[PDB]
Design an enzyme around this catalytic site. Structure first.
Site, PDB file in Angstrom:
ATOM      1  N   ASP A   1     -98.063 -28.555  49.917  1.00  0.00           N
ATOM      2  CA  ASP A   1     -96.757 -27.847  49.923  1.00  0.00           C
ATOM      3  C   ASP A   1     -95.532 -28.727  50.142  1.00  0.00           C
ATOM      4  OD1 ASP A   1     -98.434 -25.613  49.724  1.00  0.00           O
ATOM      5  OD2 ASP A   1     -98.042 -24.953  51.788  1.00  0.00           O
TER       6      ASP A   1
ATOM      7  N   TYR B   1     -97.570 -17.634  49.054  1.00  0.00           N
ATOM      8  CA  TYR B   1     -98.000 -17.670  50.448  1.00  0.00           C
ATOM      9  C   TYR B   1     -96.812 -17.734  51.398  1.00  0.00           C
TER      10      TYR B   1
END
Ligand SMILES: *[C@@H]1O[C@H](CO)[C@@H](O[C@@H]2O[C@H](CO)[C@@H](O)[C@H](O)[C@H]2NC(C)=O)[C@H](O)[C@H]1NC(C)=O
Ligand SMILES: *[C@@H]1O[C@H](CO)[C@@H](O[C@@H]2O[C@H](CO)[C@@H](O)[C@H](O)[C@H]2NC(C)=O)[C@H](O)[C@H]1NC(C)=O
Ligand SMILES: *[C@@H]1O[C@H](CO)[C@@H](O[C@@H]2O[C@H](CO)[C@@H](O)[C@H](O)[C@H]2NC(C)=O)[C@H](O)[C@H]1NC(C)=O
Ligand SMILES: *[C@@H]1O[C@H](CO)[C@@H](O[C@@H]2O[C@H](CO)[C@@H](O)[C@H](O)[C@H]2NC(C)=O)[C@H](O)[C@H]1NC(C)=O
Ligand SMILES: *[C@@H]1O[C@H](CO)[C@@H](O)[C@H](O)[C@H]1NC(C)=O
Ligand SMILES: *[C@@H]1O[C@H](CO)[C@@H](O)[C@H](O)[C@H]1NC(C)=O
Ligand SMILES: [Ca+2]
Ligand SMILES: [Ca+2]
Ligand SMILES: [Ca+2]
Ligand SMILES: [Ca+2]
Ligand SMILES: [Cu+2]
Ligand SMILES: [Cu+2]
Lengths: 712, 712
Positions: free
Chosen positions: A334, A422
């Site tokens: 990420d 997410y």
């Protein structure tokens, strides 16, 4: 307040300043990130570049000069024969004078392909996908009812996975085609497309491969001809709410028509916030949201004495399997997506208590100007619902000598990251007795793919056309403990039985526990791989002793379900060699401040930091500036309950730092919240107190939520 | 309410009834527990004896007759040639007619020595210790300033350890002599005495061995003569508060003069309590405090469907090492002490929220009459401070498509056990999305011994004269999951890599996750020892499938730091063979309802239940009534922060039960607490709701605390 300013993120003004400065250098030929070309030189990221720890400590402890303040500036050099990415220390702030090129990497050629994907690039990609699927228009409408052209009510959308290819220097993305509806993540069509978007001319980009409902087709025209000629077995897709929506449905057989209990803070915050500097009972610490890596706490003290120079999020990974090319392609890291820059607005009463203190910030990440992020962080005290301590001292004849207890409270520093599907809730938690905790909770939408039956050996059918892909969540922390000072040693304790003669009955034996200790002298001794059983007590010690002779120390306690995921050495595992070690201890160095970067996502084969290398010189770790590195994680096998979202209950990992012979006694004894009730034969027991019993009422400010994040 | 009555503990009236009944049988020759002799027949324990599960399920599900209600009655038969303990099913309730002798044990002779230690016995022991230390009076005053005779202001007290001897049939207790002051547990004198209190005539009891400050002395007279003759190297012991007290001292450098936030529940409980029957959203379950073993939940449903017939505390253990004879002797098993019967009064705002619903009960344990226990349990809903779910659906161009989130709440069923020094807080926790959790938190006073330097290889110096002994906390749960019904199977899931040709690039390879499953057919396959790596997914499945084809199941997730402590097979380990297995699955049987008993503490060599034996017939576990058994625990090395009490932060273990393909989607979607904010270009965003935003105020009832526990 005045001190913690060294650890503080860049102001809007500061970001604008660094930007004007770099824009004033005409030879850079910079263009705003919004320009519709890859063939462009742009400032992609600007953030505060922390000074050397040496100078920072001399300013904090030796009363020395304030260390010079500096911007990191990541420039994309698309507009040249050989595109590349370069980073720069721009300073000083205020009054920028220079930009100093950062960390050269001789040999490496693939900096351009290692770049994060920008807004502009996605735009251009949406252009490619519209052109190249022209032949499939009819196919789309017949299978999905949706399209890429005109589309209006029913637009096909896509989700790119990463990494992007099979070797370093590639930028070939598997795109999962979905229906753009509410919670579109859960609506894959069954089409997947591989797009080579390597060239800086979007005109050379091309769909190099097609995958539909279990079969590869080479090109779109080919799937179109084969469909049109009855050769493609297809699946035609479908008041009440979308399964992908958060809207309620179903009824509890014991229904609930009122709000549940809430926190009131009539007497205001019991912690003192000043800039990025917080105080809370014994605690003092600073914080920052590094745009690139996420939330940190810095200069953590308890009772005047340092415990941690830094605790920080380093990387967050989601490694998947799949039946489909995209599902098997997905290893998401990420930090390649601005993990600290997707800190979207917390919702009062939901994300943090209504009584929380909400804090804004600015991020300059893939942006034309600094962007205001409202309620990017929150800070709040909450009751734990469990007393910090309590004891019922009975007299075992009907009564009691006393009851004592300290109601449980905690200070939570919270932010989020929502990159795409997410939502990660990041927590740093401070208990009154010197315990600090780090937590990550996962929620939001799972990463999912079109259902075929072969895909059940890589996940779970979540809905008619939906496979929830198997994956591992792994998170890396950097835990720069400076326990009672800069110089520490690391030791571990285990229980080891002894077998001895019963000293009061020589016929018999006694097999019993004994406290065993282990010293660690070299780095490699303290690199615990996942097969190496982790000792129950992990202690980072100071030479100083407490009043009872024991070394003052802080214990690290990991909460995780991580194991080895990728084979050590194999390919993309080179990007995540920190994931070999649930704990690793290094000797501090300015060259090893981060275990990951923004480049790892798109070139994990040959990344600019391999954590394994940190251990290569296997340096001595006796009484040195030590840095702990922690991997926490969990195997996530999607289940039907993950629809529409993964729920946070039990979906959290992290670690505790606990004082261990650091304090002469329970450091929470300073708290006047304690209550001791004393027995009396006649009338009311003496409820002994040091804060008056309180029952005051107050009212939180009314709910609001902006939901936008623009410049100011 | 009407149904859950089968699972309900005995009323005061019911306990009185069973007592009168047994008292009416003159041939028992019963005397009250208070009588000052061991030579006595007494009713030591009375509790509700749960009916057979077969009959209970036919009443609950098949609409059949209510199963007969029964008391368990543990009688001590001290007043006979051959003393023993016998248990009895006394029923029916109401209207007792019989007492049926329970679970014969041919061969066994040591039932009398296996008894728990009573109040009366402690009294008599205090008499012995007063007589036998007569010679040491001067010694005491010179070393400690305290005594056993007259004493008034300064009385020496003692702490007996267990077990009591070196073989089955022994009752020889190591007593740690302490100064009776506030928190007397932390004030050992340095004297230890071994007392054989085996005989039913307290006149035959004798101090068989003495230990002082590192040396054994045979008798008290001998230590006295040797001290008096200058041969004993002794240690003379010592506004501000006692180090062993809970009274505040020290100052936070950022001081706190106000109360921190508290919960308000202006709209009352959102769960419906009726008798021992609770409803909360999807949840329905009963509960009880079994006097002997602790807290249980029974008949747990979510959404009408059963998940667990029973989840219950079975045993709680503290296994120590030591330098001193008492420290090396200590293996505490709390069920031998009435773990469910020491459920002392919860303090509102401290132990449970001010807004909690506090529940009383009655225990008949070592008592002349049933004893009222106020606020023995509490039930309350609290905010978790983390949203059950949340998602920021961005549009990645400055705005958002929606924010959704469900504020986090949980229902906590709580009790405590405070046997002596330690306070265990027991939690059963119910989340709105079908997740249930079990937690134990340890606090209160550590078990500690006199400091000599040899004792540092069994613990830590906590104060001038105080060693905190090393020990392991281990807890056993019985987890009778009946997932969607009585018949289940057990399976586990792991991630296993596959190495395959890259299907879209045949030159290269793909090494990726794949969902592996394992079936278990025999009991022994599902007995996971501590060396056997625990699979990441532990699933108890129903044959029924969900709408997406997967078996409906509940996942067991253990939170622990337990390892093997005692060597399998060695001596007192025979009492705790459940501690070999972090998870064990058995096939249900009325003969294997408990993994421990009240006798294990004092005869762990030859106890009446060895959990290992449950696995001996290694029965088939395919589609049968399965029972899970869980061991959770942690190694506790005392540290200075444990003074005056062990703090609960990070001092908890337990497990989660999570729905796994059990529900078609997130079962919390039924909740109207959800909030979705929708974007608007013009004015306020549409904050979409299904309960109105609330900001009401209410005020909790004023603090009170009785602290006594007498008959009614
Ligand atoms: C990355 O691109 C930058 C921008 O062109 C290169 O930096 C320039 O290099 C030339 C030398 O060939 C100098 O004349 C310029 O002054 C440099 N400018 C800046 C702002 O750095 C850099 O060489 C490239 N990196 C690599 C490894 O080739
Ligand atoms: C503890 O040590 C003793 C001595 O080594 C062990 O006791 C011996 O055990 C063997 C059988 O294994 C017997 O044949 C000997 O007669 C025993 N000797 C004595 C003096 O007891 C014992 O097995 C050891 N226990 C553990 C758990 O290691
Ligand atoms: C435990 O003690 C009880 C009480 O004496 C014994 O039970 C009695 O046994 C005699 C037979 O010798 C009977 O006459 C009595 O009717 C029994 N009464 C009760 C209430 O049980 C019992 O036998 C003893 N247990 C053992 C193993 O010897
Ligand atoms: C995955 O499988 C392939 C094939 O067995 C392995 O690749 C071979 O590796 C050896 C070196 O170990 C080479 O000499 C061969 O030429 C390779 N063949 C091919 C077709 O690639 C690879 O090592 C395996 N990887 C893992 C992680 O198991
Ligand atoms: C959100 O904040 C922006 C920036 O100040 C403001 O212009 C806008 O009116 C706010 N929107 C809402 C819905 O409150
Ligand atoms: C405690 O409860 C008992 C029993 O009802 C009562 O008699 C007594 O007055 C109460 N004591 C206190 C201090 O409230
Ligand atoms: Ca350090
Ligand atoms: Ca090194
Ligand atoms: Ca069962
Ligand atoms: Ca069996
Ligand atoms: Cu996941
Ligand atoms: Cu302990």
């Amino acid at each position: 307040p005045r001190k913690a300013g060294v650890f503080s993120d860049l102001s809007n003004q500061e970001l604008k300043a660094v930007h004007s400065f770099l824009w004033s250098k005409k030879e850079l030929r910079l263009q705003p990130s919004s320009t519709t070309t890859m063939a462009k030189n742009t400032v992609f990221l600007i953030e505060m570049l922390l000074p050397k720890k040496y100078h920072v400590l001399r300013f904090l402890d030796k009363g020395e000069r304030h260390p010079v303040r500096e911007a990191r500036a990541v420039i994309f050099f698309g507009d040249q024969e050989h595109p590349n990415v370069t980073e720069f220390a721009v300073g000083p702030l205020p009054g920028p004078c220079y930009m100093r090129a950062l960390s050269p990497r001789p040999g490496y050629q693939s900096s351009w392909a290692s770049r994060p994907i920008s807004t502009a690039e996605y735009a251009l990609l949406y252009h490619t996908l519209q052109e190249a699927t022209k032949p499939l228009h009819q196919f789309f409408l017949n299978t999905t009812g949706f399209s890429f052209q005109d589309c209006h009510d029913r637009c096909l959308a896509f989700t790119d996975v990463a990494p992007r290819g099979v070797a370093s220097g590639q930028r070939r993305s598997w795109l999962i085609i979905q229906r753009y509806v509410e919670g579109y993540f859960l609506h894959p069509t069954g089409l997947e497309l591989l797009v080579d978007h390597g060239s800086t001319d979007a005109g050379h980009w091309a769909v190099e491969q097609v995958w539909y409902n279990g079969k590869f087709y080479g090109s779109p025209e080919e799937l179109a001809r084969k469909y049109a000629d009855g050769e493609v077995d297809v699946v035609v897709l479908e008041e009440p709410p979308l399964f992908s929506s958060h809207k309620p449905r179903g009824d509890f057989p014991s229904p609930i028509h009122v709000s549940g209990p809430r926190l009131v803070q009539p007497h205001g915050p019991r912690f003192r916030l000043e800039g990025n500097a917080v105080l809370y009972g014994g605690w003092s610490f600073a914080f920052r949201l590094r745009s690139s890596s996420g939330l940190q706490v810095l200069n953590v003290h308890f009772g005047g004495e340092r415990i941690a120079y830094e605790v920080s999020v380093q990387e967050a990974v989601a490694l998947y399997g799949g039946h489909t090319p995209a599902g098997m392609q997905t290893k998401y890291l990420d930090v390649g997506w601005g993990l600290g820059s997707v800190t979207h607005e917390l919702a009062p009463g939901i994300d943090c208590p209504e009584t929380a203190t909400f804090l804004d910030t600015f991020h300059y990440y893939d942006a034309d100007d600094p962007v205001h992020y409202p309620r990017a962080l929150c800070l709040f005290e909450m009751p734990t619902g469990v007393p910090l301590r309590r004891h019922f001292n009975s007299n075992f004849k009907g009564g009691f000598n006393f009851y004592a207890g300290l109601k449980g409270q905690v200070l939570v520093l919270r932010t989020t990251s929502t990159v795409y599907n997410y939502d990660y809730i990041w927590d740093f938690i401070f208990y009154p007795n010197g315990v600090m905790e780090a937590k990550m909770h996962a929620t939001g939408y799972v990463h999912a793919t079109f259902y075929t039956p072969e895909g059940l050996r890589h996940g779970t059918r979540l809905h008619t056309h939906l496979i929830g892909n198997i994956h591992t969540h792994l998170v890396h922390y950097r835990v720069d403990l400076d326990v009672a000072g800069t110089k520490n040693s690391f030791q571990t304790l285990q229980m080891k039985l002894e077998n001895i003669t019963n000293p009061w009955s020589p016929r018999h034996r006694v097999v019993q526990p004994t406290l065993e200790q282990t010293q660690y002298s070299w780095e490699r001794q303290a690199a615990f791989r996942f097969k190496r059983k982790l000792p129950k007590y992990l202690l980072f010690t100071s030479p100083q002793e407490n009043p009872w002779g024991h070394k003052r120390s802080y214990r690290l306690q990991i909460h995780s379900m991580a194991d080895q995921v990728l084979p050590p050495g194999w390919q993309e595992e080179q990007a995540i060699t920190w994931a070999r070690y649930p704990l690793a201890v290094t000797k501090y160095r300015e060259s090893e401040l981060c275990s990951s970067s923004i480049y790892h996502q798109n070139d994990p084969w040959d990344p600019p930091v391999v954590f394994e290398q940190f251990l290569h010189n296997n340096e001595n770790i006796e009484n040195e500036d030590l840095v702990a590195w922690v991997t926490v994680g969990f195997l996530h096998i999607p289940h039907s309950e993950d629809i529409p979202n993964t729920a946070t209950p039990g979906n959290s990992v992290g670690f505790l730092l606990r004082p261990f012979n650091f304090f002469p006694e329970d450091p929470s004894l300073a708290s006047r919240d304690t209550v001791i009730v004393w027995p009396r034969d006649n009338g009311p027991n003496y409820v002994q107190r040091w804060i008056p019993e309180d029952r005051d009422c107050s009212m939180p400010p009314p709910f609001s939520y902006n939901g936008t994040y623009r410049p100011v």
